[PDB]
Write a protein that binds this ligand. Structure first.
Ligand SMILES: Cn1nc(C(F)(F)F)cc1C(=O)Nc1ccc(S(=O)(=O)N2CCCC[C@H]2CCN2CCOCC2)cc1
Lengths: 1281, 114, 60, 43, 60
């Protein structure tokens, strides 16, 4: 309670045993069956002895009420969770959902009053850019009747039902945290509903079906139905997805028809949705032998799933294949990847720990046979890559190593002459690398960084109290009390004596193999479709610290040698030419296949390079002697008494003696060990290999040289032939070390591969445009229900939808509608008890106040976080200037009154200091516009970092830090000319910026906030201030949109830049005192630019008017858009401080004196060395839908009179215009297109001051002593230039 | 000259004696570590892919229900004329033998290529 | 003085005879550990002393 | 007598050549070796 | 005839230089096998700890 709220969205797995435990302490009959009956036996044993507490009571009474209601319905039957989805995805009740229905009807009225003016604003914006005749007729009716289309969906009444149930359940939890009365069933027309703290009972009156749900199930149902509602509305309203809609709705029927009969295995079919789509994409391959390679495996898997579950008929399988052929077959390439957006539209399966334990136990206890020559050839290639990297970064000199006596003459002469090695020389002379021994040439710099420990990871309990995680209610005995801490940063920040070299000696000394308190546990992942479930591991403090230190030592050192030959991003975009094909596979179970013998030689070589005895062999030697178990609170062990972990059976939840690896924990080591075998198969196949890992996928690009006079299909078929030969050789070589490449699961293709931004198809991007639309959901994941963060999330999701190909104007309209509905939910349907009538009743009775609050931009005091210039380009320069331009566009189209502009300029200023201005240079000093969560995290992180006795934080954090930050900000900014951005950069690169970075990387979450609240880190005044912040910002908006002050200097049809200057002068008038503010304002993108479309003999009207400042775009005719064509960090910070100070505040001896005094705190340099070392004073369209036109266009800027920001955003806006013109057309038809984008910046000018030698008025206090901590200070910077 | 040859033979005897100590040390290590068609591996080999079986390298029609569905999906996803696609589905319903399915698959590939 | 090398050459012959016994013992150990591969005749070794050999090899 | 010693030296040359072949075939069997890994750690 | 033995003695030296490289190959194979497989050292101290130690560590 208090400042904390119950969670809004699902962030935890669904466990059957929780539901079973609630229904057994409630004594309600149910139809669940457990694979392990241990929990029910423990419940029966506890109830036989008469055990009770405060939690068993208040579910007996709820169960009594459920039984008394079920006496009224004689033929009742309980339906389990996977079998009731079709009943619960389509559920409605009129009487239970009256209040939210009235609120959304009011929201429909508020949007309908201004829909036509929103359309006129968008139409004027479209007509300004030159597309005045290209606006479709359906766009007007879809913008005006948006709420009618939203209320007409099939998911609207289930959305109302699940939103009502979720809100009442969160209210019950928030009220019961403070604490009572017995729950009472509420009788509707169709259902009867009981909502309790932990159980929700729904009885259908007609079918007499009974459903029991927990809190997590309610959250999951609300998320699924709201996502379906949003994406169905978006598909119905946009024309581009219309036929796509006709498939997706069918899918939404078909899988739901499988849920009453199949049950929990249905998600396995849902788990086939991500392979099958790619398989259907493989049906469009130019190599006709590769058409049905993956589809055969997918259909065999679907037939096996139907056969094992008792549904073994030929007709059912044939009808399912016909249904999938209807869903997945399409002709548009860009809509093949939209089914990817609908993976989480069916919910998540229920999980048990024993099934995942068996899945891990099957692979981690398997004998293997490994041949020696393949391992030694991979070791030789690995050594060759290390030698070539050291020659590359030390001028052709070999690393310190001793070749054996039996080495070949080629390797000996290569060492003597300092020559490199190819892969062929390493494979042919692998016996010369059998007895090599490296030297130490990699430093261990662990004192310079702190980022590895401040990442929050959970810790397992101690071994002797390994039963401390299970509650007493679910055990047949009394578990031991848990005394160990639960978080990494809690142990790390309270460590009075911490040394990373002692953490290294924990492994090197060998005490890690014999310590008594080492433990490791598994936990189920939150939101996945796999029915067995996936696990993540937690272990104790010291071994986790050793793991992160080892990963960082691999990352900062030898791993940079191996990053050069591979490519981190986009596969480097894949007479003779180079032709390539792709192999994609998954790496889910590859960690379980690793052994000590495979990784041992590579770990010895890394031990010799890093000079650490027996360090990198730590994982297998620790795990082969330790017992693993899967820890869930409702899944107890089958033990009648407390025993240690070495006495438990190898059954149920326990894995006794694993031989294998954990997911993660050696990722860079396994990658660096993986690449030599890829190069070995490349050498045996005679091809070239590029590699890329992405998510859970491995992608290998096979490249061969081909004559350029050949046709395209012959080149592609030759590439596919050498690719499948490489696949056979690679499969044999990976089986030689025992990793099971599994050719059934692997996709071999010539066009597409899967990466982060979508699917790459021969230079085309297939994106998931509707995936972010399903995340446009009321409220956000914050500890306090905040309206502004929710509106910012809505704007971010709609903008991310626009970047993947969705229509701009419909996304803007959906943003306005969702902001209106979010404001009405935040005022009228909330669990916040601080919502008093003094702000609720004036807002809810005044409609125009709500509409003007929804439409006003957020940088000037409103709630709209989506600017119109954001609809076309990612980067808007000045938020205030863009907000004023947007407001003037709303006034011009009669969307907003003119007086609101006056109400912007006569707004009451806030109270902020120079430090707040330097932290946020573009802020306009508004009232109560910050976030509660960010402020609470900053206060909590600062409190813990001051009160940490850790020796690494020796002198960075102290009680007088904030006074020092305020003094530095007042020194930088209180001058005769105020430059906020230069002060922001200098403050960011200083000690204050380092402290803010260290506090920012520390994620407090809920646990550290509760810890600081119990310890008294947060006083009661901060709690009462942040508990009423939403109420105060609604009051601030209400006062802003009410005041009657007017000035005659304010006028429309004036420059937005000058209005921004006037607003920044007025709102910052206490600190500035009339002094000028420089460097923040830029021209608006949409205001300064006008577009025109020109044919051959057509003349441009803007050029006839006399404007000659324009950019020129050309699109040729007859091109198919769908079809395929044819030093230290502190030293760098000190240099940055010196160059920004010298460039901003002038160049003189006093200026360099102050610059040296500021830069001396980061590095130990003199004034002369600092003066010497400092310097003295093709658009990127990939990754978006903008590529689809931009591969054919030509851009010239010869008529642009050269300011730079305008020069890139003009080309970006021109590409956006050309994308919007050809959005619904398959082909640029029969005529060339010329786009003129004219810039009108005769206004928007600033009197330039250049470098006017701005002096300092204050005195620079600095500090009594310099902090010599290696985190921020460089004692020996040396010279590099 | 023969006295000069005698000293070289003396140097050989020291080098032979140094080698036999070295082999004896490796004899001690290799005897403890290492310890004739006695036994066989119980199917720890990878299964080699044949021309009959389908894999990632290519699709070959075989066995029962899945291959017919894959061939029908190749007919549906192709760019052929709809009457020709219906006639090919009729011939696919006529075809029952596995070698006849392979012959039909090759013929369909030749139609799609041309 | 040249006829004094008779005992030196015989001293060499005992060293090579000692070497030939050590090679024959090494050839005996590597011939014992060979298994057939379903007649490749490749040797196989284990972790502690052939502990996986009961798990992997076929029971005769 | 020195001519009698030449027959013994050539006997050494044949004997070294026989040991070098048996060492070479010893390397061939050792280079083609395989490693068996157990399923579980013992303790 | 006795001066013809100098070519034979030099031929012995080439055979010995061929022999000890082949022994060094056997040393390289035995070193790689016995360290990648745990427990075959028979306590000589751990061969994985046969690295040199000065990576600016020096805690002891
Ligand atoms: C021997 N060989 N050959 C091949 C190939 F087939 F490509 F040739 C591949 C391999 C091999 O083993 N790859 C490999 C390499 C690394 C890992 S991983 O487990 O560490 N990692 C990547 C995969 C998915 C899991 C992820 C862990 C990430 N965590 C930590 C961070 O947050 C999210 C979860 C797993 C497998």
């Amino acid at each position: 309670n208090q400042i904390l709220y119950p969670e809004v969205h699902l962030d935890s797995p669904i466990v059957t045993n929780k539901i079973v435990a609630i229904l057994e302490y409630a004594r309600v009959p149910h139809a669940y069956s457990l694979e392990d009956p241990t929990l029910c036996q423990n419940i029966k044993h506890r109830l036989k002895n008469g055990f009770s507490n405060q939690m068993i009571i208040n579910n007996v009474e709820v169960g009594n009420v459920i039984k008394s209601k079920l006496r009224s319905y004689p033929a009742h039957s309980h339906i389990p969770y996977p079998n009731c989805n079709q009943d619960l995805f389509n559920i409605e009740d009129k009487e239970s959902t009256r209040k939210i229905r009235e609120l959304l009807k009011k929201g429909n009225s508020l949007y309908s009053k201004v829909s036509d003016k929103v359309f006129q604003c968008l139409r004027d914006t479209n007509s300004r850019l030159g597309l005045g005749s290209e606006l479709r007729e359906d766009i007007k009716e879809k913008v005006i009747n948006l709420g009618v289309y939203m209320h007409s969906s099939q998911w609207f009444e289930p959305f109302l039902f699940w939103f009502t149930v979720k809100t009442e359940m969160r209210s019950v939890i928030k009220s019961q945290t403070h604490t009572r009365h017995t729950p009472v069933f509420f009788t509707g027309s169709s259902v009867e509903l009981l909502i309790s703290r932990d159980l929700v009972a729904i009885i259908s009156k007609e079918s007499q079906h009974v459903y029991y749900l927990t809190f997590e199930l309610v959250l999951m149902y609300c998320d699924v139905i709201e996502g379906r509602l949003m994406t169905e509305t978006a598909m119905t309203i946009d024309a581009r997805y219309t036929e796509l809609l006709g498939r997706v709705r069918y899918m939404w029927k078909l899988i739901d028809g499988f849920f009453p009969a199949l049950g929990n295995p249905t998600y396995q079919i849902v788990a086939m949705l991500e392979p099958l789509s790619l398989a259907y994409l493989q049906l469009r391959d130019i190599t006709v032998e590769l058409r049905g390679a993956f589809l055969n495996h997918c259909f065999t898997e679907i037939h096996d799933v139907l056969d094992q579950n008792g549904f073994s008929d030929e007709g059912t399988y044939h009808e399912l294949i016909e249904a999938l052929d209807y869903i997945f077959i399409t002709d548009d390439i860009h809509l093949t990847g939209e089914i990817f957006s609908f993976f989480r539209s069916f919910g998540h399966p229920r999980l048990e720990a024993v099934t995942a334990a068996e899945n891990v136990r099957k692979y981690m206890n398997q004998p293997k046979v490994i041949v020696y020559e393949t391992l030694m050839k991979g070791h030789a290639i690995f050594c060759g890559i290390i030698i070539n990297g050291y020659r590359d970064r030390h001028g052709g000199s070999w690393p310190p190593l001793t070749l054996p006596l039996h080495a070949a003459d080629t390797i000996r002469n290569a060492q003597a002459s300092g020559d490199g090695l190819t892969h062929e020389q390493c494979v042919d002379n692998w016996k010369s690398f059998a007895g090599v021994k490296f030297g130490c040439f990699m430093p261990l710099s662990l004192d310079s960084d702190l980022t590895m420990y401040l990442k929050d990871k959970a810790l397992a309990a101690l071994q002797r109290e390994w039963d401390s995680v299970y509650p007493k209610e679910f055990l047949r005995y009394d578990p031991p009390k848990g005394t160990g801490s639960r978080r990494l940063v809690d142990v790390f920040l309270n460590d009075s004596s911490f040394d990373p070299y002692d953490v290294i000696m924990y492994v090197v000394s060998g005490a890690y193999l014999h310590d008594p308190e080492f433990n490791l546990s598994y936990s189920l992942k939150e939101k996945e479709i796999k029915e067995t479930g996936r696990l993540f591991a937690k272990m104790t403090y010291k071994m986790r610290a050793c793991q992160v230190i080892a990963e960082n030592l691999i990352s900062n050192g030898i791993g940079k040698y191996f990053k050069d030959n591979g490519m981190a991003k986009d596969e480097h975009d894949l007479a003779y030419e180079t032709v390539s094909a792709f192999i994609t596979t998954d790496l889910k179970k590859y960690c379980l296949n690793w052994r000590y013998e495979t990784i041992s030689l590579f770990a010895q070589r890394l031990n010799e390079i890093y000079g650490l005895p027996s360090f990198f062999q730590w994982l297998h030697k620790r795990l082969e002697t330790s017992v693993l178990y899967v820890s869930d609170p409702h899944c107890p062990p089958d033990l009648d008494a407390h025993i240690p972990l070495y006495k438990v059976p190898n059954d149920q939840i326990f894995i006794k003696y694993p031989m294998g690896g954990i997911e993660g924990y050696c990722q860079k080591l396994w990658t660096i060990s993986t690449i030599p075998y890829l190069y070995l198969a490349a050498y045996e196949s005679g091809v070239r290999i590029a590699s890329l890992v992405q998510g859970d996928n491995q992608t290998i690009a096979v490249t061969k040289r081909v004559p350029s006079t050949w046709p395209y299909n012959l080149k592609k078929r030759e590439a596919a032939r050498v690719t499948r030969d490489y696949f056979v050789i690679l499969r044999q070589r990976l089986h030689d070390i025992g990793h099971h490449l599994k050719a059934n699961e692997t996709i071999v293709s010539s066009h597409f591969f899967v990466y982060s931004k979508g699917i790459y198809y021969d230079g085309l991007l297939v994106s998931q445009s509707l995936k972010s639309i399903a995340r446009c959901v009321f409220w956000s994941e914050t500890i306090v229900d905040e309206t502004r963060a929710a509106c910012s999330n809505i704007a971010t999701t709609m903008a991310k939808s626009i970047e993947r190909g969705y229509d701009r104007y419909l996304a803007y309209s959906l943003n306005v509608l969702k902001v209106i509905q979010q404001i009405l939910i935040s005022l009228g349907f909330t669990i916040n008890s601080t919502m008093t009538r003094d702000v609720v009743i004036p807002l809810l009775t005044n409609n125009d106040l709500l509409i003007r609050m929804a439409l006003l931009p957020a940088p000037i005091g409103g709630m709209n976080y989506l600017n119109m210039s954001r609809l076309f380009v990612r980067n808007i320069g000045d938020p205030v200037t863009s907000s004023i331009a947007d407001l003037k566009r709303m006034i011009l189209a009669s969307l907003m009154p003119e007086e609101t502009l006056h109400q912007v300029m006569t707004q009451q200023p806030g109270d902020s200091s120079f430090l707040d201005w330097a932290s946020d240079p573009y802020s306009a000093n508004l009232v109560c516009v910050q976030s509660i969560t960010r402020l609470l995290k900053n206060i909590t992180a600062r409190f813990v970092l001051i009160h940490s006795p850790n020796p690494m934080l020796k002198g960075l954090f102290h009680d007088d830090s904030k006074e020092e930050d305020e003094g530095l900000a007042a020194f930088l900014m209180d001058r005769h000319i105020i430059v906020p951005r230069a002060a922001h950069e200098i403050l960011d690169h200083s000690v204050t910026g380092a402290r803010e970075s260290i506090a920012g990387m520390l994620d407090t979450t809920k646990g550290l906030i509760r810890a600081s609240m119990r310890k008294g880190g947060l006083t009661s005044r901060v709690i009462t201030r942040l508990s009423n912040y939403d109420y105060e910002q609604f009051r601030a908006g209400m006062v802003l949109l009410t005041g009657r002050k007017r000035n005659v200097l304010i006028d429309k049809e004036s420059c937005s830049v000058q209005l921004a200057r006037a607003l920044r002068s007025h709102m910052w008038a206490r600190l500035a005192r009339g002094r000028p503010i420089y460097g923040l304002e830029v021209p608006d993108v949409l205001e300064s630019m006008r577009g025109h479309l020109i044919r051959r003999h057509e003349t441009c009207v803007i050029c006839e008017c006399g404007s000659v400042n324009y950019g020129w775009f050309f699109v040729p005719s007859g091109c198919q858009l769908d079809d395929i064509d044819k030093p230290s960090r502190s030293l760098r910070s000190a240099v940055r401080i010196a160059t920004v100070y010298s460039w901003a505040y002038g160049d003189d001896d006093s200026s360099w004196n102050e610059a040296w005094l500021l830069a001396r705190q980061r590095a130990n340099v003199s004034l002369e060395e600092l003066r010497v070392i400092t310097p003295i004073s093709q658009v990127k369209y990939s990754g978006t839908s903008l590529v689809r036109v931009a591969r054919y266009t030509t851009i010239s800027n010869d008529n642009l009179s050269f300011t730079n920001f305008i020069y890139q955003q003009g080309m970006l806006l021109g590409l956006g215009v050309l994308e919007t013109l050809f959005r619904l057309e398959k082909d640029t038809g029969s005529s060339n297109t010329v786009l003129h984008l004219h810039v009108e910046t005769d206004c928007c000018v600033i009197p330039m001051i250049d470098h006017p030698r701005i002096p300092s008025s204050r005195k620079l206090e600095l500090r009594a002593e310099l902090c010599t901590n290696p985190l921020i200070y460089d004692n020996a910077p040396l010279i590099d230039r | 000259s023969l006295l000069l040859l005698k000293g070289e033979v003396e140097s050989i005897k020291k080098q032979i004696n140094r080698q036999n100590i070295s082999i004896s040390t490796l004899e001690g290590h290799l005897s403890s570590i290492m310890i004739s068609r006695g036994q066989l591996l119980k199917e720890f080999q990878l299964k080699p892919i044949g021309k009959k079986m389908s894999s990632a390298v290519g699709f070959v029609p075989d066995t029962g229900p899945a291959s017919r569905s894959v061939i029908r999906s190749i007919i549906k996803s192709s760019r052929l004329e709809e009457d020709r696609k219906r006639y090919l589905m009729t011939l696919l319903d006529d075809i029952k033998g596995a070698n006849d399915l392979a012959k039909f698959h090759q013929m369909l590939m030749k139609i799609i290529m041309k």
